[PDB]
Amino acid sequence: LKQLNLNNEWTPDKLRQKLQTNAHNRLELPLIMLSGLPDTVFEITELQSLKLEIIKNVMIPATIAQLDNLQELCLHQCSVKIHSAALSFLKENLKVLSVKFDDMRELPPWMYGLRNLEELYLVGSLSHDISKNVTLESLRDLKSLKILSIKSNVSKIPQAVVDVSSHLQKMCVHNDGTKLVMLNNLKKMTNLTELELVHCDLERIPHAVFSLLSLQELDLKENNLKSIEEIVSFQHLRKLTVLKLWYNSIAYIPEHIKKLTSLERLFFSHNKVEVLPSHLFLCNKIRYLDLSYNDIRFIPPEIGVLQSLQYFSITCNKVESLPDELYFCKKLKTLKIGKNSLSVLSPKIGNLLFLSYLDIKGNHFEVLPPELGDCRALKRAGLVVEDALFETLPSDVREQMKAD
Amino acid sequence: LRQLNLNNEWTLDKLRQRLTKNAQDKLELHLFMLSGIPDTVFDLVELEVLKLELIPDVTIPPSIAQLTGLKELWLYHTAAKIEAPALAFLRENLRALHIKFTDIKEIPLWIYSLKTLEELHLTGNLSAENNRYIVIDGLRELKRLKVLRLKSNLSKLPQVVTDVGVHLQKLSINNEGTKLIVLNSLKKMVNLTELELIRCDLERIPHSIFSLHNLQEIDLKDNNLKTIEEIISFQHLHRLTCLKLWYNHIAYIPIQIGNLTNLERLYLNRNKIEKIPTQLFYCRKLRYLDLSHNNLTFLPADIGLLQNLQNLAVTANRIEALPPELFQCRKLRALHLGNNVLQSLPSRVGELTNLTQIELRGNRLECLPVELGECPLLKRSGLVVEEDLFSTLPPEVKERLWRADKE
Amino acid sequence: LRQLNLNNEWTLDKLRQRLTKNAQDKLELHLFMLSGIPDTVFDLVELEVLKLELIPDVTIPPSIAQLTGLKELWLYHTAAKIEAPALAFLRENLRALHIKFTDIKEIPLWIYSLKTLEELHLTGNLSAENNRYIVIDGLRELKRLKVLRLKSNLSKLPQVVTDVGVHLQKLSINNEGTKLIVLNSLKKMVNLTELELIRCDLERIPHSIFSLHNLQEIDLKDNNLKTIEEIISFQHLHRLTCLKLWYNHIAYIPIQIGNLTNLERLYLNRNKIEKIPTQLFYCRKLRYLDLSHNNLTFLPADIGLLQNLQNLAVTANRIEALPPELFQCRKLRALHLGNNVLQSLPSRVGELTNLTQIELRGNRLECLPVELGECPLLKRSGLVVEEDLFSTLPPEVKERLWRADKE
């Protein structure tokens, strides 16, 4: 009778007008605060995703076979059951899953029965009894799983992660203040390319992270790293181009970063570094160098080697003296020096032909020079300056960036 | 008693709030799972399209004389009996009838008496033993029929449409997996401007489309077209402007498509094409080049020659880098670059002005360049992108785009 | 009790509520599906068109003599009973009378004694078995009748119609998909000044049309004419001011039709005309013109010859530009040029200050030229311009347009 009232209450017109898009650019139905699924859901055969939010004890019929365009499910606090032919259809059709489990029962055991799974987002609150999860160890059934984002307290890395060592390409954990241990599993990653260990309570770089051999993007955000020392073996990560180590407590960068000559994306913002090293600038391949909100006192003059640097965010730092060697590098496109400790701006800035971003807000300046008109790629919307200093510019210099 | 009560409960104001609008911008009313049809529905005057779905054995009252704006009668699984004055009114007013039925006896027999009807949508199997097109042999009585949609699993195309197609202008046949033995029978059917053979499993383009000359919109969706080499003869079709060769098994494009200079929309999406020959890029009249969900790995620079291109949708491809010549065409209105492997989007997109919606979410895009904010008509609804990718733009440029969302 | 109850139902206030106006700008009162006629509806002296649609058991009391402006009686499916004083009142005020009937069942009998009316309409099948046009034999006493319009799906031309039509001025024949066998019997119909043949599906012009020197309007709409080879015999006539060959399939219009100088209005829209010849536009006094929904690939030379025109309909064809040919015309007021492939509007259209309307429902314009800002006479409600196209005008020009919309 509840199912009949559900079919009467939610006409197909109401579900059609409920239709919208999700964060993955798919047609998603955000079914929120309901008793079950209506039978008029499956009349919208063009649907590509359903967001089920707090809809418990739901039994999915076989009529889901009409959802040919369906490739994603997002289960938010839903203890959902499925029927056998529907299970087979979603085994042969589904690609993306995202299940949140405020309670353990809200995580369904049926969802691991598929094999066409590519992307999984295992947000929730996992218990510390992680190795006991045979439901987790069923990810070996998935023969295409490449994205695995577990937003839960993952103290010990599961052997479920061991069973998906090869096919995985993106590995994301938000451990939320729990130390990540049992490193041999992350040693067993063979073909993993993106390791996203966000806030795994790592007191330093784990030896497991360093036993990776095919990594391309490493993120240790909100992990209280003490040092970057083992780098004599980062040379085996020639496939690595992205190093994400910001919002951390690192205080220095030794010369060892010279081992990786394929490093492009470097993140060291919001760190405890008080003086930028010159041997960091010795590497010239680095194109993205992020050091915003740091404690940097000054920039050594070896930064002229960093010609390929297209991003040098030194904004909101303690930097008082900026050397002229940085202005020799003309490829720097996104440069932010806002809220810094500078006194005057360098007149020689016109050699930066490719310079879209310039941010100088908050920093104390005496007089804006006319040489700010010398920048070619600069834009008035791209040149974030106060209105008072916008007044302190020549009218031709105003129009140089104001008129497109 | 049920009919009278249904007339009583379905009040006028609740019907007014029940009124909606369709894709054709006509006032609409969907009657789904009722005992009969309310007379207060028939009291309406502003209604244009009434939708009769799952109505068991109802009779149309003559109060349809009030429904003057009524032009589209939508019959879904509805066995309708008809009153004679209402029959005359529908003969002189009703112009579009869609009939879906599960049994060949469910179709009303008074649809042949309609004379002002031009659009017919016979969805549901017309092919049955001794009822194979003999039931619809009365569409010879139909004279002004121009649109004839047939989602009916037809094994062979009827002889009755060969008789009727002198005046027919659109033939949308959906067999849902049954091949047509066309036998070049469209030669007597000379007035078609559109032909939509969808889900027919043809596996080859027949020659009946080639014998015709008046076609301007050709759709061959889901016909399992492995090879499309016949298109060299399509220069004979001097009026074609929309060659919708999508949802097929097309793995390559022959160079003779360069002879097709009259194409304006070339819908090749959801195909297996891996390389675009440059001869396809000769056609200056292409406006909607949708090559999404395909195997393209690179985009040729000759796309800059296609100045009339507006919506280039290469969604879910293998294109790693956009050439600068792509931004040579200044008429790009909707650059659907989503789900691709675009490493970085060049700043030349700041030169584009007609861009209204660009899709970059799901790419390998490292950061969003500042010049993307130079497009005037672009807004947040148009600029769909990941939030962290949005954060890479300057907060003044982000303020400009957030204002375009606001203003 | 029944009359009192229906009197309490329909008071004078609700009658003024239901009062509308028709296409003739006359006061109409749509009375539909009433068990009886009201008396308050005859109390209102303002009423001019008394509408009686599908009202059974009709017995009109002499209070219809209370009506002052009663010149129209739109009785549809109504069996009217009228007493002798009310009939005599009808014999001095009633002028126009429309009948909708199902054969002999719903045909009134008092209409023959009416000898002072001037207009009459009929609708309903008449060619019954053993009763071939025998029910309309009593219309001989009507001497002041001037307008007779028929829509009665006639399989053959009634001889009674030919005998009756001696005192006729306007006659329209609608067969809704039936052959009309004139058989040169319209030679007696010398007094006809407008001959409408709507959906006569003739496919040939009858030779009796070439004998009447009073016809100013010839209407052959939806006659499925493909090759007009009978206009050479139209040269004998010197009265036809407007030919109506629209909603047909005329592939080409021959040269000889350019010899008709008296033609002033060409309705040829929704036809199969590929190229309209310049010699045809030697007649420059073409005030009205309808050429929409056609296959014209360019607007030809002798449109420059045209000078005494007021509109051209160029909707839905293959014309790319407004050439100097349309620009040598200095009296055009409405441009029906929508959903076209018109590339641009050149400059001189910005001199056309007397521009009532333009139609641009999907046209391919780059932008409205600043010369259109030269005319404040064209207002935002006056012209029909797409919102994205309209916004490209300067902010001063757009503000002036909204101002003139208010002003």
Swiss-Prot record, chain A:
<keyword id="KW-0406">Ion transport</keyword>
<feature type="repeat" description="LRR 12">
    <location>
        <begin position="261"/>
        <end position="283"/>
    </location>
</feature>
<comment type="similarity">
    <text>Belongs to the LRRC8 family.</text>
</comment>
<keyword id="KW-0813">Transport</keyword>
<dbReference type="GO" id="GO:0034214">
    <property type="term" value="P:protein hexamerization"/>
</dbReference>
<feature type="repeat" description="LRR 13">
    <location>
        <begin position="285"/>
        <end position="306"/>
    </location>
</feature>
<keyword id="KW-0597">Phosphoprotein</keyword>
<dbReference type="GO" id="GO:0005225">
    <property type="term" value="F:volume-sensitive anion channel activity"/>
</dbReference>
<feature type="repeat" description="LRR 17">
    <location>
        <begin position="377"/>
        <end position="400"/>
    </location>
</feature>
<keyword id="KW-0433">Leucine-rich repeat</keyword>
<feature type="repeat" description="LRR 2">
    <location>
        <begin position="22"/>
        <end position="44"/>
    </location>
</feature>
<feature type="repeat" description="LRR 14">
    <location>
        <begin position="307"/>
        <end position="329"/>
    </location>
</feature>
<feature type="repeat" description="LRR 4">
    <location>
        <begin position="68"/>
        <end position="89"/>
    </location>
</feature>
<feature type="repeat" description="LRR 10">
    <location>
        <begin position="214"/>
        <end position="236"/>
    </location>
</feature>
<feature type="repeat" description="LRR 6">
    <location>
        <begin position="116"/>
        <end position="138"/>
    </location>
</feature>
<keyword id="KW-0677">Repeat</keyword>
<feature type="repeat" description="LRR 9">
    <location>
        <begin position="189"/>
        <end position="212"/>
    </location>
</feature>
<comment type="subunit">
    <text>Heterohexamer; oligomerizes with other LRRC8 proteins (LRRC8A, LRRC8B, LRRC8D and/or LRRC8E) to form a heterohexamer. Homoheptamer; inactive, likely because it is not targeted to the plasma membrane in the absence of LRRC8A. In vivo, the subunit composition may depend primarily on expression levels, and heterooligomeric channels containing various proportions of the different LRRC8 proteins may coexist.</text>
</comment>
<feature type="repeat" description="LRR 3">
    <location>
        <begin position="47"/>
        <end position="67"/>
    </location>
</feature>
<feature type="repeat" description="LRR 15">
    <location>
        <begin position="331"/>
        <end position="352"/>
    </location>
</feature>
<feature type="repeat" description="LRR 8">
    <location>
        <begin position="167"/>
        <end position="187"/>
    </location>
</feature>
<protein>
    <recommendedName>
        <fullName>Volume-regulated anion channel subunit LRRC8C</fullName>
    </recommendedName>
</protein>
UniProtKB/Swiss-Prot annotation, chains B, C:
<keyword id="KW-1003">Cell membrane</keyword>
<dbReference type="GO" id="GO:0045663">
    <property type="term" value="P:positive regulation of myoblast differentiation"/>
</dbReference>
<dbReference type="GO" id="GO:0006820">
    <property type="term" value="P:monoatomic anion transport"/>
</dbReference>
<feature type="repeat" description="LRR 10">
    <location>
        <begin position="213"/>
        <end position="236"/>
    </location>
</feature>
<feature type="short sequence motif" description="Di-leucine motif">
    <location>
        <begin position="305"/>
        <end position="306"/>
    </location>
</feature>
<keyword id="KW-0744">Spermatogenesis</keyword>
<keyword id="KW-1133">Transmembrane helix</keyword>
<feature type="repeat" description="LRR 7">
    <location>
        <begin position="142"/>
        <end position="164"/>
    </location>
</feature>
<dbReference type="GO" id="GO:0032024">
    <property type="term" value="P:positive regulation of insulin secretion"/>
</dbReference>
<dbReference type="GO" id="GO:0009986">
    <property type="term" value="C:cell surface"/>
</dbReference>
<feature type="repeat" description="LRR 1">
    <location>
        <begin position="10"/>
        <end position="21"/>
    </location>
</feature>
<dbReference type="GO" id="GO:0006884">
    <property type="term" value="P:cell volume homeostasis"/>
</dbReference>
<feature type="repeat" description="LRR 13">
    <location>
        <begin position="285"/>
        <end position="306"/>
    </location>
</feature>
<keyword id="KW-1015">Disulfide bond</keyword>
<dbReference type="GO" id="GO:0015810">
    <property type="term" value="P:aspartate transmembrane transport"/>
</dbReference>
<keyword id="KW-0221">Differentiation</keyword>
<keyword id="KW-0677">Repeat</keyword>
<feature type="repeat" description="LRR 15">
    <location>
        <begin position="331"/>
        <end position="352"/>
    </location>
</feature>
<keyword id="KW-0433">Leucine-rich repeat</keyword>
<dbReference type="GO" id="GO:0005225">
    <property type="term" value="F:volume-sensitive anion channel activity"/>
</dbReference>
<dbReference type="GO" id="GO:0098656">
    <property type="term" value="P:monoatomic anion transmembrane transport"/>
</dbReference>
<feature type="repeat" description="LRR 8">
    <location>
        <begin position="166"/>
        <end position="188"/>
    </location>
</feature>
